Homo-oligomer: 178 residues x 2
């Protein structure tokens, strides 16, 4: 339903607003109906799941009817559909996690080729489109390449991943040396 | 409309959910219509106001239609009605800030009286009700007092401030010595 995009290693906050502003009853589960977190009494309980030590919520907001699921240090494998149920309300949020790495290690010399690769959830793939510090916008799919660099691209580029009308943005600084 | 209670020196997060999940146009102002924060383009702008260095929002949530106003290090004078307007939606949140201090400095001796006082927004007042580490629940208004303590109250008490169907909770540890 709602699509949220996140970046590998960053933290996301998936929202859940219900009615009757009050810490009433709710939980978040994943696609296999594994409960990730929910409220016990007025307490937060986290059962044993792959996200146990990386998930959490903001308890102060429960009185206002908000039950966020927060996930930190994202992994492409946290990509999944999550469901929030408050009393008798269900709310599906699909999280997609991507990563953009530069397989060109370090020390880049003029005339060298740059290759980037986008990491993505096996379940769903997008279109990436980067921009050099001075112009040219190379765009591709899971692998991008800039055949030969010129001292002018030394700088900080910006790639764009776009899934659903959503989008994330990575900015890497590349150093071309004479 | 929605009533949120906060504790002096703590941080609160006032919520604002609108529709069309997207960083569209919004701002938060106070009762004098002083804009506290809002979005410029895709950027956060804070104008000059008494809260400028203590307010903020969470930009990642704007794409999901959430525009929180976050306030830190609370002052009883931040108590006020705030309004969120997203496109053409208005949403009033009244924030009430209280404080509970122990005018009994330190070193409390058996048989001594304990006096607590609740600090509150000149505009609106509540009913406080504390609890000793072993029983008796003294309750009053802006000033509470425990005529004489007994080694048994050495511990950590819990006071309750209740405004609207809302409530905040302070827990102070008192030390009675022989």
């Amino acid at each position: 339903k709602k699509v949220v995009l996140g970046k590998k290693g960053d933290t996301v906050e998936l929202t859940c607003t219900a009615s009757q502003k009050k810490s009433i009853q709710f939980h978040w589960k994943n696609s296999n109906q594994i409960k990730i977190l929910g409220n016990q009494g007025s307490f937060l309980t986290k059962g044993p799941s792959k996200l146990n030590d990386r998930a959490d919520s903001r308890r102060s907001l429960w009185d206002q009817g908000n039950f966020p699921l927060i996930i930190k240090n994202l992994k492409i494998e946290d990509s999944d559909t999550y469901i929030c149920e408050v009393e008798d309300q269900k709310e599906e949020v699909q999280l997609l996690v991507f990563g953009l790495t530069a397989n060109s290690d370090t020390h880049l010399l003029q005339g060298q080729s740059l290759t980037l690769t986008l990491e993505s959830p096996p379940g769903s793939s997008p279109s990436v489109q980067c921009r050099s510090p001075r112009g040219k916008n190379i765009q591709g799919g899971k692998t991008l390449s800039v055949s030969q660099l010129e001292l002018q691209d030394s700088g900080t580029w910006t790639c764009t991943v776009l899934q659903n009308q959503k989008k994330v943005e990575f900015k890497i600084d590349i150093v071309v040396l004479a």
